[PDB]
Curated annotation (Swiss-Prot):
Enzyme Commission designation: 3.1.3.48, 3.1.3.2
MF terms (GO), sorted A to Z: acid phosphatase activity; non-membrane spanning protein tyrosine phosphatase activity; protein tyrosine phosphatase activity
Post-translational modification: Phosphorylated by LCK. Phosphorylation at Tyr-128 increases its phosphatase activity.
PANTHER family to which the protein is assigned, alphabetical: LOW MOLECULAR WEIGHT PHOSPHOTYROSINE PROTEIN PHOSPHATASE (PTHR11717:SF35), LOW MOLECULAR WEIGHT PROTEIN TYROSINE PHOSPHATASE (PTHR11717)
Entry protein name: Low molecular weight phosphotyrosine protein phosphatase
Known role: Acts on tyrosine phosphorylated proteins, low-MW aryl phosphates and natural and synthetic acyl phosphates.
Quaternary state and interactors: Interacts with EPHA2; dephosphorylates EPHA2. Interacts with EPHB1. Interacts with the SH3 domain of SPTAN1.
Similarity remark: Belongs to the low molecular weight phosphotyrosine protein phosphatase family.
KW Transmembrane helix (keyword) present: no
CDD domains: LMWPTP
Amino acid sequence: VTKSVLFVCLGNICRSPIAEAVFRKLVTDQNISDNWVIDSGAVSDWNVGRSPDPRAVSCLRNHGINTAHKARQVTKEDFVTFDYILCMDESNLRDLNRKSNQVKNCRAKIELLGSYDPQKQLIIEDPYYGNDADFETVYQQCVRCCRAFLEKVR
C-alpha cells in the first residue's frame, strides 16, 4: 500500500541516480507516487555528498527528467526499512548480500534490476569510464526494467 524501493549501484553517481529518477517519473505519471518511498544509494562511500555525474544529469534532462539526489551510502538500516533493493550488476549484488548477512531479520528483497528487463539484458554496466551513448543505454534499460517492475509489484 505504501512500498519502498532503494536503487543501488557502486558510486551512486551514474546508474542508480538514473534508475531512481525514471521510477519516480513513472509512478508520478501513473498517479500513485504517494504509494511509494523511493531512494538510491551507493555500495561505496567515494562520492558521498556529491550530486549525480554531469553525464547522468544531461541524459536525464534530455528526456525531460531532473533529480536533486546527492550520493549517500547504503547502511544496515536500509535492509530493514526498504521492501526492494534493486541493484545494477553482480558485484553490487555480491556486496549487498555480504552486507545483508550482517543484519539478521533483513526485510528487503535484493535483486538485479535487469531481472525485469523484457529484453533480458541482465546487467546494467557501469558507464563511468564510457561516453554519453552509454549513459543513454543505461537510461533505456532503466525505463524497460522499471515499467515491468511496477507491473509485477502489486
